[PDB]
RNA sequence: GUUUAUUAAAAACACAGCACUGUGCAAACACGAAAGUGGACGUAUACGGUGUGACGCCUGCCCGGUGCCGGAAGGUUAAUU
RNA sequence: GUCUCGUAGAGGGGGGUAGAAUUCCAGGUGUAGCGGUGAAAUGCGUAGAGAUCUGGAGGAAUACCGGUGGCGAAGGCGGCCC
């Protein structure tokens, strides 16, 4: 299937590229996510005539993501409280939803889909390092302090 | 206790009863009762689809709490009871807030005992926790297979499961069959063994005692005519063929599991 | 094909045979020889000379790896306990350590019944 | 009212929890009219042989006089505490207060 | 009295391989040899002493 | 019914033939799958029961054109 | 106890007991182009299939044939290309 | 024969636990033998055994101490802890 990329897609190409991808790749991911469109004559001519504003919007999105990442980094450390045993091990667990809620209460709005926990979901009291992905290329870090 | 009947009649000579002088002698707890009428082994086409089922005693269904998700609130066992629907006994328990429920009765549970469920419950028989919070090597019963679905494994009298290992999001279990089975560690399990272990020691003693339980006679295929069963036929007692079901499938060792969807959870088959 | 220069020679000295296996320090085998495989059978297979020949053959088999230093682990009561070590030293290796690793149950399983010969 | 000597070994990665465990256990003993004759913290020591693939452990020694019920509860706590890798409870003829050969 | 914590003293009554030395070799009285054996076994369990030298 | 919502493909009958040419009646069924199609112009997913051929037809013609055809035919989705 | 309503009531069938075997639950299995339903609001001390037939003392040798179970290095081998 | 203080002891019943070793399972290295006997053969091995390293499962018994040593009516009783 021939498609026109509407953004930067890793291992595929840059915006405006015309690429041949597997039909399922286009059908179930790229088009529904908005990262590409079918390479019909209408689409090709329309995009080529109306192209540059899209890079302007992509730059605006990247700048907004950078600003949000800077705010997240400036937030530094966020503290979450739960219940645990005397050994410091939590009976329950601390996940993306409540981490994002704590960050939002701290001031920066982050969705649960932007939380990236490398070593699974937190289960012990102490300090952990969590990552945030607000853009496909930028990354932020937050210290999480779990207390009883 | 296991009690042998005296042979005052040929139908009583071989009877062995399991007599428990702790079960409630009165009526069950009505709000947790439902009617349950009989099928005779017939489906909604009205056809017999499982042979040898019919008759037997009328039975009310007791609503049993297999989920055990009323967390953080202690309950006290009020009494043990007979349940016609299953081999295990059940226990009526009263929660602190005034709610009553039925649970499977673990071995050793008696009236006055306290039970609890949830991540912070004590490691004691009758308490229910996610297996993430149960020590490896423990004996448990009424084990969930999906978190929140409710207990499904080791529910029969005297049965239990062993937690043999815990790796990541999964625990490995030794089932009563001998199978080693992976289950999510967020699945719940109740500490201890199912009670009423003496159940298997009973001896029915007469044909009628099976009829009381809703079991109708088995007719051997070799006792039939060929039109009825692959085994039928013969001038006298004849066989001369590989044993099969009434529908022709070998019935002496041929395996019939075929579930590629759940194969990934079987660490080791029972044999 | 990778140089090691620091190996371990395991001697399995049983009453009937001697097995010599040279590994690296992590237990990965590089080569082996046995008294039974070095042209000896029957009563000849269970002699110190056969064990020495097996040790020489094992040294030859590991010659490519360029081993210089050898620890030695001897296990079993067989007659090839010391001839193998002597041959290994004569082959040019530097014998750094010698250790007995014969297993001894601390009780253990019941042994087979006594032979009535 | 009997006299006990309790030695327990903590996983080295949980060495920071040792003072908390010591305080909790001593409080549990003293709650039921128990006495602590001796309390020593040997710190991390090298094990003579590996235990659970470890090579060092944090040793704590206590000498107390406590009822059997609280001693059994303490043993249950040791069994179900994942940090305690090995414990040992012994009866002693009398109270022991003198310094151990470790210190 | 023999103390299972007295590792320095206990080490005089074990071989290089860790085995308990006979009282007929050490010149120890029998009553104290029994206490020594008990103390050594306790120390082995607490991992203050090795069971075998291949540790 | 085992019918494609896009092409109208449905079971057809024919014969199995053996080497001795014995004919026994059989059916040929369509390769149908229930699939969630993203409609961009309505910001939603619509589920259709479609043959693999119908999926190719949607790839070629666009889900909007196909859905307009379905509305014209009166086939609800 | 059951049976050839209408020439056979029996030594036949069933039976409690016994064994083999299948079945980890959306169970095996069965009715059903299917959806579903029975199995079971049961969960291996459970459920199906098969043989034997209270109880007592017992149940020896043969895996070459046929079947079932396991293996997968090699030979041969379909559509496809 | 009873009481008071103390002593040694594999005396008994119940529960827990530790280390060595055997077997089995999985994986890594590695290659033509292994195992067995008086000598052999059956058996195991190129479908990768035996050997060596790592992880796991499980049952049974407790090296050294240990002794014409101890305890128990006899039969008998042996790691450690309660
Ligand atoms: Cu239809
Ligand atoms: Cu083929
Ligand atoms: K019942
Ligand atoms: K029958
Ligand atoms: K027949
Ligand atoms: K017949
Ligand atoms: K006949
Ligand atoms: K523990
Ligand atoms: K009759
Ligand atoms: K009949
Ligand atoms: K069965
Ligand atoms: K009889
Ligand atoms: K009888
Ligand atoms: K045969
Ligand atoms: K055969
Ligand atoms: K083949
Ligand atoms: K005593
Ligand atoms: K023991
Ligand atoms: Mg109908
Ligand atoms: Mg049946
Ligand atoms: Mg029933
Ligand atoms: Mg039967
Ligand atoms: Mg007939
Ligand atoms: Mg037929
Ligand atoms: Mg005949
Ligand atoms: Mg015949
Ligand atoms: Mg057939
Ligand atoms: Mg032998
Ligand atoms: Mg002779
Ligand atoms: Mg015709
Ligand atoms: Mg009738
Ligand atoms: Mg008649
Ligand atoms: Mg008649
Ligand atoms: Mg169902
Ligand atoms: Mg179905
Ligand atoms: Mg159903
Ligand atoms: Mg018969
Ligand atoms: Mg054969
Ligand atoms: Mg086969
Ligand atoms: Mg086994």
Automatic annotation (TrEMBL), chain A:
Q: Does the keyword Protein transport apply?
A: no
Record-linked InterPro entries? Ribosomal_bL9, Ribosomal_bL9/RNase_H1_N, Ribosomal_bL9_bac/chp, Ribosomal_bL9_C, Ribosomal_bL9_C_sf, Ribosomal_bL9_N, Ribosomal_bL9_N_sf
Cellular component GO terms held in the UniProt record: ribonucleoprotein complex; ribosome
Q: Does the keyword Ribonucleoprotein apply?
A: yes
Specify one Pfam family: Ribosomal_L9_N
Please report the organism this UniProt entry assigns to the protein.
Escherichia coli
Instruction: Please give the biological process terms from Gene Ontology that the record holds.
Output: translation
What Gene Ontology molecular-function terms does this entry list? Answer: rRNA binding; structural constituent of ribosome
Q: What is this protein called?
A: Large ribosomal subunit protein bL9
Specify the Ribosomal protein L9 domain's residue ranges: 13-40
UniProt record similarity statement: Belongs to the bacterial ribosomal protein bL9 family.
* Database matches in PANTHER family: 50S RIBOSOMAL PROTEIN L9 (PTHR21368)
Q: Which UniProt keywords apply?
A: Acetylation, Coiled coil, Ribonucleoprotein, Ribosomal protein, RNA-binding, rRNA-binding
Recorded coiled-coil stretches: 37-64
Question: What exactly does this protein do?
Answer: Binds to the 23S rRNA.
From TrEMBL, chain B:
Protein role: One of the primary rRNA binding proteins. Required for association of the 30S and 50S subunits to form the 70S ribosome, for tRNA binding and peptide bond formation. It has been suggested to have peptidyltransferase activity; this is somewhat controversial. Makes several contacts with the 16S rRNA in the 70S ribosome.
GO MF annotation, one: rRNA binding
Modification sites for N6-acetyllysine: 241
Matching entries from NCBIfam families are given as:
rplB_bact
Q: Output the SUPFAM superfamilies linked to this UniProt entry.
A: Nucleic acid-binding proteins (SSF50249), Translation proteins SH3-like domain (SSF50104)
Q: Which GO terms describe its cellular component?
A: cytosol; large ribosomal subunit
Task: Give me the stretches of Low complexity compositional bias.
Answer: 38-47
Extract the InterPro entries matched here. NA-bd_OB-fold, Rib_uL2_dom2, Ribosomal_uL2, Ribosomal_uL2_bac/org-type, Ribosomal_uL2_C, Ribosomal_uL2_CS, Ribosomal_uL2_dom3, Ribosomal_uL2_RNA-bd_dom
Query: Which gene carries the instructions for this protein?
Result: rplB
Start and end of every Large ribosomal subunit protein uL2 C-terminal domain?
Answer: 123-250
Q: What is this protein called?
A: Large ribosomal subunit protein uL2
What does the record note on quaternary structure?
A: Part of the 50S ribosomal subunit. Forms a bridge to the 30S subunit in the 70S ribosome.
Organism, as annotated: Escherichia coli
One Gene Ontology BP term is: cytoplasmic translation
- Which UniProt keywords are listed? Acetylation, Ribonucleoprotein, Ribosomal protein, RNA-binding, rRNA-binding
